[PDB]
Structures are given as C-alpha cells and as structure tokens.
Amino acid sequence: SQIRQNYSTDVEAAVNSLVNLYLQASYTYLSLGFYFDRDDVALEGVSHFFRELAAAKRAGYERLLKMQNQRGGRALFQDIKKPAEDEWGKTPDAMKAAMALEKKLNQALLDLHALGSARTDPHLCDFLETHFLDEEVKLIKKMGDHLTNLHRLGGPEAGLGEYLFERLTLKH
Amino acid sequence: SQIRQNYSTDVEAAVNSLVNLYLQASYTYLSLGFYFDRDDVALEGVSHFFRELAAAKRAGYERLLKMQNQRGGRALFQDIKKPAEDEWGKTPDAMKAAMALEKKLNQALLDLHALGSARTDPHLCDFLETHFLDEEVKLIKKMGDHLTNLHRLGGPEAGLGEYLFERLTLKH
Amino acid sequence: SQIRQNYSTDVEAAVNSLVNLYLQASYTYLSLGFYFDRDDVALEGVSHFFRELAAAKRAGYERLLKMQNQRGGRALFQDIKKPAEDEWGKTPDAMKAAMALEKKLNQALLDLHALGSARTDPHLCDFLETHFLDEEVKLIKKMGDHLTNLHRLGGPEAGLGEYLFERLTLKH
Amino acid sequence: SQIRQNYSTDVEAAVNSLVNLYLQASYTYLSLGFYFDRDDVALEGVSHFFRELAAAKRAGYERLLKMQNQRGGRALFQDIKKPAEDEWGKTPDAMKAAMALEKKLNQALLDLHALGSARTDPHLCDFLETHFLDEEVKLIKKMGDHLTNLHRLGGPEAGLGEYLFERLTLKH
Ligand SMILES: [Fe+3]
Ligand SMILES: [Fe+3]
Ligand SMILES: [Fe+3]
Ligand SMILES: [Fe+3]
Ligand SMILES: [Fe+3]
Ligand SMILES: [Fe+3]
Ligand SMILES: [Fe+3]
Ligand SMILES: [Fe+3]
Ligand SMILES: [Fe+3]
Ligand SMILES: [Fe+3]
Ligand SMILES: [Fe+3]
Ligand SMILES: [Fe+3]
Ligand SMILES: [Fe+3]
Ligand SMILES: [Fe+3]
Ligand SMILES: [Fe+3]
Ligand SMILES: [Fe+3]
Ligand SMILES: [Fe+3]
Ligand SMILES: [Fe+3]
Ligand SMILES: [Fe+3]
Ligand SMILES: [Fe+3]
Ligand SMILES: [Fe+3]
Ligand SMILES: [Fe+3]
Ligand SMILES: [Fe+3]
Ligand SMILES: [Fe+3]
Ligand SMILES: [Fe+3]
Ligand SMILES: [Fe+3]
Ligand SMILES: [Fe+3]
Ligand SMILES: [Fe+3]
Ligand SMILES: [Fe+3]
Ligand SMILES: [Fe+3]
Ligand SMILES: [Fe+3]
Ligand SMILES: [Fe+3]
Ligand SMILES: [O]
Ligand SMILES: [O]
Ligand SMILES: [O]
Ligand SMILES: [O]
C-alpha cells in the first residue's frame, strides 16, 4: 500500500473484526426496535430508543471502515450473525440485553486499544479515545440509569411502571 | 348515463351499501364521542379520539359518494341503523368495539376490492387502495397498540390506568 | 394477533425473506462504497453512488419491517450473508454487479407481488407498487445508462474514461 | 525555568529538531508551488495545492514553537536546508516527492510521540495526537488518492491526463 505507515496487520484484522461486531450490534438494535413496535408490545419510546442505537452503531462501523481506508488497511466482511433473541421480553429484559451488548462492545474497544498501544500505534489509540470510548461510557451510564428507574418501577405493579417509564423518560 | 364506462351495476350497488356502512360507523363514533364526554365518564382525550374518527368516517363516505358521481353511478340512501350500544363501558371496552367496527369496515373494503377486481374495474380497485386500504391498516394498528397499553394498565389498578392512558397517550 | 386481517403466513414469511435480501443488498453496497474509497481505487463519486444505495436499501428493509408490524406479522431475522466479492474491479465491473443485484431484488419484489396477488392481498400489492416497484425500474434504468456511458468510454483508453465518468457524471 | 514541569531536555531538543524539519518542508512546498506556476509548467491547480501545503506546514512549526514556549522549552534555530530539487518534473513526480516528504514528517512525529511516551510526557503526546497525527494521516491518504488518479491518467496519453487532473480534481 502506498500510504500505509505504522499500521500493523494485527490492528487491520482486529479493526475488520470490530466492524463485524458493530454490524451485528446494529442488527441487534434493529430487531429490538421493531420488536417494541409490535402491536402486542406497543412501547413507542422504547422502540425509538433502540432504533437510535442501531443508527449510532452504524455510524461506528462506518467510521471504522473510513479509518481502515485512511490507514491503508483493507476491509474484509464476514457474515453477520442474527441477533441472539427473536422476542425481547419486557423493557427491563431488553435494557439488560442492551447493557450486555454495550459492555461487550466496550471490551472489544478496550482490547483493540490495548493492541494498538502494544504496536505503538497512537493514531489508532486516539481514534478510539476520541470517537468510541467516551460514547460507550456515556451510553452505559444512561443504560444503568434506565435500569435503575425500571427496577424502582418494577415488581407487582410492573405493567404500569413500564408504561410510565416509556411515557415520562423515553422521548415520545 | 353519458359518462359511465366500465362501471358495473354490482359495484354501483356495493358502493351504495359501503356508503351506508360508513354512515353507520360515523354514527357509532358520534355516540362514543359524546359518551366519553358525560360528566360521569369524563375522559376528554377518549372523547376527542372517537370524535376524530366520526369525522374521518364522514370523509370516507363523502369520498365514496364523490366517486359514485364521477363514475356515473347513482347514490341511493337507506336508513342509518342506530349504534349497537347506548353505554360504552370503560376505555378498553370502547376501544374493542372500535376495533371490531374497523375490522368490519376493512372486510367490506376488501370484499368491494375483490368485486371490482372480478369485474376488471381497476379505477375502483386503486381508488380503494389509495384512499381506504392503507388508512384502515394504520388505524387498526393504532387501535391495537392502544389495546395493548390499556391491557398493561389494566386489572386491579384499572381506574388509575384509564386516567393515565387518557392523559399521557390520548392527545389532550 | 389482535390486528391481523387478510395477512397470509406465506406473505409474512416471504416478507421476512425479502428483508434478509435487502439487508444483504445493503451490505453489498457498503462493501462497494468502501472499496471505491481505497487509496488504490480512489473514485470518490463511485464511492458516493454505492454508499447512497446502501442507505436506500436500508430504507427499504426498514419500510418492510414497518409494514410487517402494521399487518400484524412477526419479523424473524436470519444471518446476513457476506457480499459475493472482496474486491470489485473497475467501475464497469462494479456497475454490472450492482445491475445484477438490482435485477435479483426486482425479481423478488415481482415474485412477492405475484404471491400477494395470489392470496388476494391488495394492501401488500399496492405497498410494493407504491414504495418499491417504480424505484427499482428508475434505478435499473440509471444503472443501464451508466453502463452505456462506461462502455462508450471503454476499451484501450479505459483509465481516462473511468476518471472522466466519475468526475463528469457521478456527483462529486 | 519558572514554569517547566515534566518537560525533558530530550523532548525540548527533539521539538527544536522537528521545527527545522517543518521549516524545511514548508520551504520544499514553496519551491514546488512556484515551480508549477512557471510559464513552461503552467498547472495552476497543482501550484495552489503545494502553496496550501507550504502554509499548512508553517502553521505546524508555529504551533510547535508555541508549545515549546508553553512548556518552558527554549527554541533554537538551525539553517534551513534548501529543497532537494530545483525542477520537479511532472505532476506524478512532484506528488511522489510530496508523499515521501509527508511520510518523513509522519515518521518524525511518531518518533517524537514514542520519545515523549518514554519520558511519560502525556501533554506532549496528546498535543501531537490532536494537532499533528490525524492531519498527516488525512493528507497522506489524499496524496495516495491523487497518485492513484494520476496513474490511471498516465502512460501514452499523459499530457492530457495531467491537464484533466489539474482541471477536474485540483481546485481551480
Ligand atoms: Fe433519543
Ligand atoms: Fe430464547
Ligand atoms: Fe425466541
Ligand atoms: Fe490521547
Ligand atoms: Fe491515548
Ligand atoms: Fe432524542
Ligand atoms: Fe429522538
Ligand atoms: Fe406518541
Ligand atoms: Fe387525534
Ligand atoms: Fe347492551
Ligand atoms: Fe345499553
Ligand atoms: Fe394499484
Ligand atoms: Fe391494484
Ligand atoms: Fe397497588
Ligand atoms: Fe391529534
Ligand atoms: Fe386533535
Ligand atoms: Fe384538558
Ligand atoms: Fe447521488
Ligand atoms: Fe472472486
Ligand atoms: Fe476477492
Ligand atoms: Fe395493483
Ligand atoms: Fe489515443
Ligand atoms: Fe446526489
Ligand atoms: Fe449526493
Ligand atoms: Fe471532490
Ligand atoms: Fe485546496
Ligand atoms: Fe536532480
Ligand atoms: Fe535540478
Ligand atoms: Fe495518547
Ligand atoms: Fe481548497
Ligand atoms: Fe483553495
Ligand atoms: Fe483558472
Ligand atoms: O430521541
Ligand atoms: O387529535
Ligand atoms: O448524490
Ligand atoms: O484549495
């Protein structure tokens, strides 16, 4: 590659791998979005929430692909694994799956930062620090706050709580 | 008729019949509207909802009458049957009646489309596809979502649920 | 399903299947987009073209999922197969792959319309006629025009032709 | 120095050295700029391109000098070596020299980041990551794309290609 400089084959491949993980996360949020729009689930604000996250994850993989091209890497695509569930349960259930997905993405970002740090690749490191790491932290914090409010709204009176949460916390 | 072309007497008569069904549906929504405005029911957002539907149904029969005249058909009017109930119960009860009415209207639209398809009358078919069929589907979906939220708000704590739903979902 | 009406299990399943085909088409256009952005391909207007198509295909599957929910269907997701190529060749090569993909999507839309016509499902038919069929026809025509201009720019002097086409036809 | 803190004499000296390298790069782009403005070269867009880079490199050394003063370092200036060529050839030739210069600057930035990382100097590191490293990567990618388009426009018909490239890619 005429442009490649300080860009290890390991990072290149781990970037391709993180791309597939963003693709799959996007796909998982697509499924969660349409799930909460089902006439028998009918929680519009929950649906909007997961739909925004599909979009955000798509921006992530688009940014990883762009950086791949900028460093002289070559994208390679693999199959995107279908989401882990077909039916997502109640808002708390779904929010827990989302939390678990985001922790997985955050761990992959941290592992990739470790890798690029090990190959003394500071461009790759700060790319992750600037466009990914703070976004994950903010988003995980938000999901935690959501889980805390669902839990406080939970238990015996849980149908009402899920309604209120969707109406009063989730936008629209 | 100097203008009539490709317009079967069967469609003409089924159009007159669907007009009476829209008239009766309009009438049913009138009754539901004023019912939820009673001082001892007092759910303004529910009342507004059913009042908007009376208006929407009236637009439907006005459009059917206009098309009747445009094709060279002749309108004939029959008595409009009074609504099936005088008292409509609680929001879920009323919403179920509305769902059942809309399914009946949708079945009549589908039967009329089948008929006009059988008389190879594509103008009539696409008139229904453009001005009626998508409206029914959207409206049925909405009523289903409503029923799902009333159900989740239902059971022991149902008075509070009906209040919240009217305040937080139904506009005004 | 409390809302489902005139919505066959066959259409439901063929809709789920067409969703996966749009997902895979989107994915193929993603790969084509980043491919033409490689420092050693470097045809920005070609890249923009395929990137817009990824977005358009994504709008398609989002619309299919929305309609699925509106009719009372249930989305089911399968793995998304990786694109057929890793490297896409020259502009004419890529444009031919795109043409072939769009013909496949158009054939699937036509087969689904045939199916829904066979189950006398006019809502499904006109949904496809309104949001899909004309879009395919316009897009195929455009791809054909592109192929005709690449061909006229082709042969011995082909490097120059690909440059001119990207600069003077493809926007930016 | 009353302000100096965590600022090694090695970084200080390597900063002075990188300043001279930016000064010399600026000087090289000055020469390339006026070269493409010669009546017998006459490629205005190529000239503008290299002139903008002289300016960009000057901003770099001005920023390095400012940071030097901010950390309590002392600037020391050495002779600026004349550019390596008097005559720069054709657009591809010049673009290759520019690529080679930018790779040299990028290697010096990476070496300085390694150094400041070794002296645990995170201010210096992030200064480079924020104001230098991404700029180099973007600029190298652009130069690569340029070289790819010149190459595709090259060979037998090369005079025409250089004209088109200057007119249709290079701004003005
Ligand atoms: Fe939001
Ligand atoms: Fe399961
Ligand atoms: Fe399941
Ligand atoms: Fe940093
Ligand atoms: Fe860092
Ligand atoms: Fe928002
Ligand atoms: Fe929003
Ligand atoms: Fe709303
Ligand atoms: Fe309203
Ligand atoms: Fe009764
Ligand atoms: Fe009664
Ligand atoms: Fe039609
Ligand atoms: Fe039709
Ligand atoms: Fe209670
Ligand atoms: Fe309204
Ligand atoms: Fe209103
Ligand atoms: Fe009020
Ligand atoms: Fe465009
Ligand atoms: Fe192959
Ligand atoms: Fe290949
Ligand atoms: Fe049709
Ligand atoms: Fe020639
Ligand atoms: Fe455009
Ligand atoms: Fe555009
Ligand atoms: Fe451009
Ligand atoms: Fe410029
Ligand atoms: Fe020489
Ligand atoms: Fe010389
Ligand atoms: Fe750093
Ligand atoms: Fe400019
Ligand atoms: Fe300029
Ligand atoms: Fe000029
Ligand atoms: O939102
Ligand atoms: O409304
Ligand atoms: O575009
Ligand atoms: O420029």
From Swiss-Prot, chains A, B, C, D:
Keywords: Acetylation, Cataract, Cytoplasm, Cytoplasmic vesicle, Disease variant, Iron, Iron storage, Lysosome, Metal-binding, Neurodegeneration. It comes from the Eukaryota. One of its GO terms (molecular function) is identical protein binding. One of its GO terms (cellular component) is autolysosome. The keyword Iron applies. Residues 5-154 form the Ferritin-like diiron domain. Fe cation binds at residues 52, 55-56, 59, 62. The keyword Cell inner membrane does not apply. One of its GO terms (biological process) is iron ion transport. Residues 52-59 are annotated as: Catalytic site for iron oxidation. It is found in: Cytoplasmic vesicle, Autophagosome; Cytoplasm; Autolysosome. Belongs to the ferritin family. PANTHER family: FERRITIN (PTHR11431), FERRITIN LIGHT CHAIN (PTHR11431:SF47). It is linked to Hyperferritinemia with or without cataract: An autosomal dominant disease characterized by elevated level of ferritin in serum and tissues, and early-onset bilateral cataract. Cataracts may be subclinical in some patients. Oligomer of 24 subunits. There are two types of subunits: L (light) chain and H (heavy) chain. The major chain can be light or heavy, depending on the species and tissue type. The functional molecule forms a roughly spherical shell with a diameter of 12 nm and contains a central cavity into which the insoluble mineral iron core is deposited. Iron enters the spherical protein shell through pores that are formed between subunits. Mutations leading to truncation or the addition of extra residues at the C-terminus interfere with normal pore formation and with iron accumulation. This is Ferritin light chain. It comes from Homo sapiens. The lineage of its organism: Eukaryota, Metazoa, Chordata, Craniata, Vertebrata.
